[PDB]
Design a protein around this ligand. Structure first.
Ligand SMILES: *[C@@H]1O[C@H](CO)[C@@H](O[C@@H]2O[C@H](CO)[C@@H](O)[C@H](O)[C@H]2NC(C)=O)[C@H](O)[C@H]1NC(C)=O
Ligand SMILES: *[C@@H]1O[C@H](CO)[C@@H](O)[C@H](O)[C@H]1NC(C)=O
Ligand SMILES: *[C@@H]1O[C@H](CO)[C@@H](O)[C@H](O)[C@H]1NC(C)=O
Ligand SMILES: *[C@@H]1O[C@H](CO)[C@@H](O)[C@H](O)[C@H]1NC(C)=O
Ligand SMILES: *[C@@H]1O[C@H](CO)[C@@H](O)[C@H](O)[C@H]1NC(C)=O
Lengths: 106, 231, 54
């Protein structure tokens, strides 16, 4: 019976405007919008940049996500950044894997 | 007069995009009689010693072998033997090195731990340990960074892989970096990288600062606006 | 429309037709799910599990 209005994965939100029938008598049925949000509490400010500050503030204006300052890594998407590496004095760029679990070659 | 064949470290395989074999002999008199040929499993020898570097502070002889071989050829399991004909050695010896057969591939889960609260209370130094757990093959490569600036190789010291007690196939590695507690108290981010085969693109990184390593306080300012937001 | 028909979840669209439109026609819909809500049990979970969503 749930109608999942929004499932934005950056600003994790699961607004479900599920209708609930009231008791045995209809015509007073209640409508409820369950904004289930999972604040990460640990993700960095610029989530793709690990060296950025920590998120001490989480704005969830529901108007924007109904229709970006990304917070939570999406399952399918891979967030990564280049890293410097030194082995014998050579500084070689290479891509990283900030979410290795979902970033296997597929 | 000891010569040892060094198996190809994955650091050279990946970052330099080449395979180099070094069967170096040290603590021997200089006669320049070394004839080093990296004979393969087949009769053909891929390459001989190149760029011999005798110059050292101790003035002892030092001949280093080289073998530029294909990475796929390495993965095929072909073995290579280094032979030394120096008169110091009583007889020539061949050092066969082979790529291990049937090694399982498992992701190197990288966990970065912050210095203990008590250690910071010491107000003298703080040690950050990057733990690499559950990886196969045993070979692994770890480096350290701070806000995009790699640290000196001496500042961070890593441990040789040892078997994982619960998973005999897997291994674990241990790398520790030390910094002044003021640097840690500043909140400077420290990032640890692990270069290993099992990873998707062979490199993964994790970072930690004062505010995320078992922090005492969670300062949240959660704000929601336009709760209704019908659409 | 009937009272009981609106009581159930049947959505309607009042497609209008105007000249000054990009697609030349506008469709807007509603239903009981789009109406005034009463209850909001936002769970707003707070977890140290940060990277993965849900
Ligand atoms: C900081 O956030 C910005 C977006 O707000 C991003 O910066 C760019 O991200 C793209 C995405 O692949 C990269 O190709 C660019 O290289 C990034 N910019 C620069 C200057 O490198 C990114 O999420 C964060 N920036 C960095 C450097 O990680
Ligand atoms: C606690 O939170 C409030 C409001 O969110 C803020 O004003 C205050 O500075 C915070 N205190 C600490 C110690 O973070
Ligand atoms: C805590 O959060 C509040 C509200 O965002 C902010 O004003 C304050 O500076 C923060 N303090 C710290 C120490 O992060
Ligand atoms: C919302 O209220 C109902 C009772 O009408 C209750 O059963 C439910 O647990 C509440 N939702 C919460 C606590 O998230
Ligand atoms: C919100 O309330 C409904 C009752 O209609 C309940 O079924 C639902 O589980 C509640 N939300 C959560 C997250 O439990």
């Amino acid at each position: 019976e749930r109608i999942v209005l929004v499932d934005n994965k950056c600003k994790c939100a699961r607004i479900t405007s599920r209708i609930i029938r009231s008791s045995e008598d209809p015509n007073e049925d209640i409508v409820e919008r369950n904004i289930r949000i999972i604040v990460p509490l640990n993700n960095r400010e610029n989530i793709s940049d690990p060296t950025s500050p920590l998120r001490t503030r989480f704005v969830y204006h529901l108007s924007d996500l109904c229709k970006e300052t990304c917070y939570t890594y999406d399952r399918n998407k891979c967030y990564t950044a280049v890293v410097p590496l030194v082995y014998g004095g050579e500084t070689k760029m290479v891509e990283t894997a900030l979410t290795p679990d979902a970033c296997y070659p597929d | 007069i000891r010569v040892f064949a060094i198996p190809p470290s994955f650091a050279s395989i990946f970052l330099t995009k080449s395979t180099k074999l070094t069967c170096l002999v040290t603590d021997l008199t200089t006669y320049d009689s070394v004839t080093i040929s990296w004979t393969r499993q087949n009769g053909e020898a891929v390459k001989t010693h190149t760029n011999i570097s005798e110059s050292h502070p101790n003035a002892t002889f030092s001949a280093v072998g080289e073998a530029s071989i294909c990475e796929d050829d390495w993965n095929s399991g072909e073995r290579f033997t280094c032979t030394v004909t120096h008169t110091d050695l009583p007889s020539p010896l061949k050092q066969t090195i082979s790529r291990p057969k049937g090694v399982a591939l498992h992701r190197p889960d990288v966990y970065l731990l912050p210095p203990a609260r008590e250690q910071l209370n010491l107000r003298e130094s703080a040690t950050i340990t990057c733990l690499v757990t559950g990886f196969s093959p045993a070979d692994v490569f770890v480096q350290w960074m701070q806000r995009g600036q790699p640290l000196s190789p001496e500042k961070y010291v890593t441990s040789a892989p040892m078997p994982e007690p619960q998973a005999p196939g897997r291994y674990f590695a241990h790398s520790i970096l030390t910094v002044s507690e003021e640097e840690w108290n500043t909140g400077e981010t420290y990032t640890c990288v692990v270069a290993h085969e099992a990873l998707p693109n062979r490199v993964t990184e994790r970072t930690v600062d004062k505010s995320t390593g078992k922090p005492t306080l969670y300062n949240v300012s959660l704000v929601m606006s336009d709760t209704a937001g019908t659409c | 429309v009937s009272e009981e028909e609106w009581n159930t979840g049947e959505t309607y669209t009042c497609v209008v037709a105007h000249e000054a439109l990009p697609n030349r026609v506008t469709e807007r819909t509603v239903d009981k799910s789009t109406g005034k809500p009463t209850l909001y049990n936002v769970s707003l979970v707070m977890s140290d599990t940060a990277g993965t969503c849900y």
